[PDB]
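Researcher: Final request for today, and then I'll write up notes for the group meeting. The sequence and the SMILES for potassium ion follow.
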Amino acid sequence: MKTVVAIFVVVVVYLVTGGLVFRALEQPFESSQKNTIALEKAEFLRDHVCVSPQELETLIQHALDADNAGVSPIGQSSQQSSHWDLGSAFFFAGTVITTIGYGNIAPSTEGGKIFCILYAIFGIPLFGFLLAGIGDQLGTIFGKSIARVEKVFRKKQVSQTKIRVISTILFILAGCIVFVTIPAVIFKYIEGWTALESIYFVVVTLTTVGFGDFVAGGNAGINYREWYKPLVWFWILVGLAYFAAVLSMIGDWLRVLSKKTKEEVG
Amino acid sequence: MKTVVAIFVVVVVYLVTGGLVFRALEQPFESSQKNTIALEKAEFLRDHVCVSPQELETLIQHALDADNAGVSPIGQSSQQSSHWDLGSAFFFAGTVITTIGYGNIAPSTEGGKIFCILYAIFGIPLFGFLLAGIGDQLGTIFGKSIARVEKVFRKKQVSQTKIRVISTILFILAGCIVFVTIPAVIFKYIEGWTALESIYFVVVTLTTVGFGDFVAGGNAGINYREWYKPLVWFWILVGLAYFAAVLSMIGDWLRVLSKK
Amino acid sequence: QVQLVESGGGLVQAGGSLRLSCAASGRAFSTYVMGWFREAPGKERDFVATLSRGGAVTYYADSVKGRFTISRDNAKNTVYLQMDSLEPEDTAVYYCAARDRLGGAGTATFWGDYDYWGQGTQVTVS
Amino acid sequence: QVQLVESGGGLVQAGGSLRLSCAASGRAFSTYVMGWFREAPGKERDFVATLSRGGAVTYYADSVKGRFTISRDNAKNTVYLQMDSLEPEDTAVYYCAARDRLGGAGTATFWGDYDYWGQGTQVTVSS
Amino acid sequence: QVQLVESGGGLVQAGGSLRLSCAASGRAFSTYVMGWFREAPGKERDFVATLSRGGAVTYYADSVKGRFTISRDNAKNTVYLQMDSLEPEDTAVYYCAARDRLGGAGTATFWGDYDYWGQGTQVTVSS
Ligand SMILES: [K+]
Ligand SMILES: [K+]
Ligand SMILES: [K+]
Ligand SMILES: [K+]
Ligand SMILES: [K+]
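Model: Predicted protein-potassium ion complex:
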């Protein structure tokens, strides 16, 4: 009753602080970009008298609508390819059960919305057992690798607490290279994103936030290799279980900090 | 090891089946839609001879360069509202720590992307601490309300397992009216969405999927009331805990089905 | 709500001509894709002709190509349909329609592709 | 499904002692975070004590700190709760709980933080 | 890489006139924001005049407003600067610059706002 109110106050303060920081970091640039395209549009109207202000704003608005829906407004004909072909439909099904939900592909039909509701109600807990199994498989593999070292070093194990500590340290160090650093390097070369855009995609994907602004394997102008789609699929599958384990440890550290605050305030 | 492979096979089959169903339900409708920006752009060039193809291409490319990083909900891109005013920046901060991430508002700047990475790393576990407390608060409140029912159930010599099952189903039934049915009725009248679109929004939001195709409080053409934004904020906050408890019960039902 | 009002129409002999017009309300006519449809008694609304937002790109159904001419005047918020070499098969209630959606006029050949509709004008060829 | 069975409660006079035990089934007890909760009649289940997977990190509620002691024997799949200096306020049904989810070492103080639960053991302290 | 070549300067008396021209290479001249800058000896390039992609929107510095006229001919890939009522203060090397970026000419008043530059044409006005 009192602990839940204390954490609610901390979360509200964290949200207000975050809102103030994100506004200071984004609003002046957004205001600069809004006036920048506004002046270019106003000059376009005086250079091209045959076009009226509404006529131009209709095409510009529709160009933005097509771009945000996956169809590039640059070039002669884009053909729009297919968002619901068996391959992309399988990947869409994954964005639902994993709770990432990029939103680049989403059901328009009534049948798709009805099926999506039931698909997430039974699929999300089903994926959670696979994620618990993968986390256990990773912990058992890392536990075996630490037990082999403790056998060759001739150290007597009083309890599996020493193995648990060493395996958590090696897990977050090695796992950061395998699921965070190396993938971002691949995304920089394949997608052509910046070093920051690539690392921003990894965190947003593995934390299940999935804004949809950056999606690996979604550029029509890029001919992706045969191994690329299944590699990203396997990276999300295991990388979600890695990030969930790291975020669980961070949650424990915050719970430990709460007991220190309780003791100091008492 | 063998258990993990068995669940992986089930998940892959569930994904392939889902892919086949979503393709059959969406691909024929997608193939029917012939409206494209390429034909509208080609017609624009013949209607306005004073503009050349490269002159139009230049303005269209610059419009995309000046566009926000977020993809606005379906049918709400011509709003031109400030995506980063204190109010909508507070709501954006919520989409990160709750893991919903609609993506209607998203950081374009380098400073925003760096801060968003650290904001998610420390904010998501912080919100989890709160969600655990809210789930406990819901369980205690429900437990107090059902204590009269459990007293009558215990009087008639009913086993403690039978009482546990009936109580959990009553949590889903009352909780569905409070966090699923009543909110969807409000979204139908306020947003003007269909009965299905409103229920589709609720499930996608409370399961933290958050596609971004439907966002409550994102229509420029609708003048929202003063109480609307904080009501949706409070519904998301406590509704996530109810849905996490329900999804946990669904997982238990699947484990029971496995023993059968 | 945008209002579309049709005028012109009537009863003519086979081979004669007619000129339909459709006035629209508001100040966004130049942004709509305009089109003409026809409802024969007991038959569904068939596509007749469509026109780009500016009026330079015309599209026609195979049954009226070479005989009908769709044109527009954004200055007067009006869309026109000149019907030459009329046949008894062209006897139907002609509807004017406006489209305020993404895409070009070339693909707006279905009645469901439009957002606003007129009251209809009767055209009879004997 | 993992089964938790409690034993060792009863009725004692104020100031006396008790020792509860909770036996678990399966061969993964050493991987669970064990905890004790108590349900007073008409009151919600409150946190009593929690213990890490090995047993080296203990955490207690302010009402039972200095009087109660949580311990575990992974060899016998059992978690214990030694209750010294019992007060009439400690009269409640005590529940044993196991957490197989990662973490929870001293921080698992909510009922929702656990995955498996016991039947409950009655503990009564009289004046 | 886009090449910009200036022609048309020299040495004139105070009050006289000059007409500079800048030819550009490639087929994307109609998409660039064209501008004129001047480098006085020992100084950084000051802004003189800027022009929209089509040539209908002109912007000038306060020191050259009403005397200089910037114009363009997309047909010949050329930008012009007519300098009337010349003063000794106008003496500098005039640079031609092209901007292939998002934005109107109205804000392109800094040297860093441009992407391509010419080699410079010397303009001298004597008393
Ligand atoms: K999400
Ligand atoms: K999402
Ligand atoms: K999520
Ligand atoms: K999203
Ligand atoms: K989105």
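Model: Residues 68-259 of chain B form a domain with the Helix Hairpins fold (CATH 1.10.287.70). Chain B touches chain A through 116 residues (CB under 8 Å).
Researcher: Thanks, that's everything.
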